[PDB]
Amino acid sequence: GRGGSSTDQPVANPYNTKEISLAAGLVQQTYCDSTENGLKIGDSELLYTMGEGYARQRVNIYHSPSLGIAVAIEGTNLFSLNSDLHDAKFWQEDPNERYIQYYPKGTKLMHGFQQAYNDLMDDIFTAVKKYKKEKNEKRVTVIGHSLGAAMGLLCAMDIELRMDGGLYKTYLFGLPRLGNPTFASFVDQKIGDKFHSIINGRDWVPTVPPRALGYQHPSDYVWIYPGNSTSAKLYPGQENVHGILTVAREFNFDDHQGIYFHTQIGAVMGECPAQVGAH
Numbered sequence: 001g002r003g004g005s006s007t008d009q010p011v012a013n014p015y016n017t018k019e020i021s022l023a024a025g026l027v028q029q030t031y032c033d034s035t036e037n038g039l040k041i042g043d044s045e046l047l048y049t050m051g052e053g054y055a056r057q058r059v060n061i062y063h064s065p066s067l068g069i070a071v072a073i074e075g076t077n078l079f080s081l082n083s084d085l086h087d088a089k090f091w092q093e094d095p096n097e098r099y100i101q102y103y104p105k106g107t108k109l110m111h112g113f114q115q116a117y118n119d120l121m122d123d124i125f126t127a128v129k130k131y132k133k134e135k136n137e138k139r140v141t142v143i144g145h146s147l148g149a150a151m152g153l154l155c156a157m158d159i160e161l162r163m164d165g166g167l168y169k170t171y172l173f174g175l176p177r178l179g180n181p182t183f184a185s186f187v188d189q190k191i192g193d194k195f196h197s198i199i200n201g202r203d204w205v206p207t208v209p210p211r212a213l214g215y216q217h218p219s220d221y222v223w224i225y226p227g228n229s230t231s232a233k234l235y236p237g238q239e240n241v242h243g244i245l246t247v248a249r250e251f252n253f254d255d256h257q258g259i260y261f262h263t264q265i266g267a268v269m270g271e272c273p274a275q276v277g278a279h
């Protein structure tokens, strides 16, 4: 029920690893200058970019034959996730006015991630509607890594709830917790079969903010283990007890900025342009 912890055993990874590998390149490219004429990443053409990862996360919008209009959100450290949890960035708050009317009463979201999404949301919705129309494209995929993965989860819900035609898929890498148990179960209800959370190895970022602050993940993730390998399993349900805490975390960004199905998401340190499938 709300706030529970699944005990089910893991199963083989059922997700499309080609799609994951592509999505990892589409988001890695958001850590890079994306102003080039006609840039191509994997099967995708870049249509639009905004922001530079200093004041706001860079957002890149692509068209892809496999993912549709793909919106990728950078996750550079505009604030630190390893900081004092009493600070205001980690407080829970109501949904922003733009979408509160779509959510169950009692939904809460983390301030730092919600505010950063709210800075971008109307420009994202305008650009996605623009490019869906230009490309006769019904499918919208939202992709994010690190802080951009929690922003990406909020954006993927916003598209499903408020944009005509809803969401196709979301691919989220190294996803922090974002909302409370009401939120997590609503994600399952609205986008559960479109949701893909990928965690690599010993990454600590999916453990923060902690459950003791009222935060809960949606159901399911695929854990690549060992980190950077091609071996992965799906851990079903919310907060599966058999998953990542069974292997001690690392407290650096090595696996967080690791290899996801042959594509490195090295972040600012990484590959520019991104290289789908290169590892």
Ligand SMILES: *[C@@H]1O[C@H](CO)[C@@H](O[C@@H]2O[C@H](CO)[C@@H](O[C@@H]3O[C@H](CO[C@H]4O[C@H](CO)[C@@H](O)[C@H](O[C@H]5O[C@H](CO)[C@@H](O)[C@H](O)[C@@H]5O)[C@@H]4O)[C@@H](O)[C@H](O)[C@@H]3O)[C@H](O)[C@H]2NC(C)=O)[C@H](O)[C@H]1NC(C)=O
Binding pocket: 201, 227, 228, 253, 254, 255, 257, 258, 259, 264, 265, 266, 267, 269, 270
């Ligand atoms: C999963 O993959 C990620 C990368 O996507 C790994 O993250 C990196 O982790 C390392 C620590 O293990 C961090 O430390 C820095 O690494 C820098 C990169 O060093 C490699 O590449 C160099 C350039 O090609 C190369 O010269 C270097 O080789 C030298 O050092 C080796 C030991 O480190 C030694 O074995 C070699 O023979 C040679 O002397 C490395 O191959 C390095 O420049 C820094 O000095 C520092 O050590 C990186 O910052 C992390 N990268 C990112 C993007 O965060 C992660 O560790 C992988 N996970 C696992 C479990 O291995």
Ligand SMILES: *[C@H]1O[C@H](CO)[C@@H](O)[C@H](O)[C@@H]1O
Binding pocket: 006, 007, 008
């Ligand atoms: C995990 O284990 C619990 C009991 O600990 C079961 O109720 C559940 O179905 C799953 O097997």
Ligand SMILES: [Cl-]
Binding pocket: 051, 052, 053, 054, 055, 056, 057
């Ligand atoms: Cl910026």
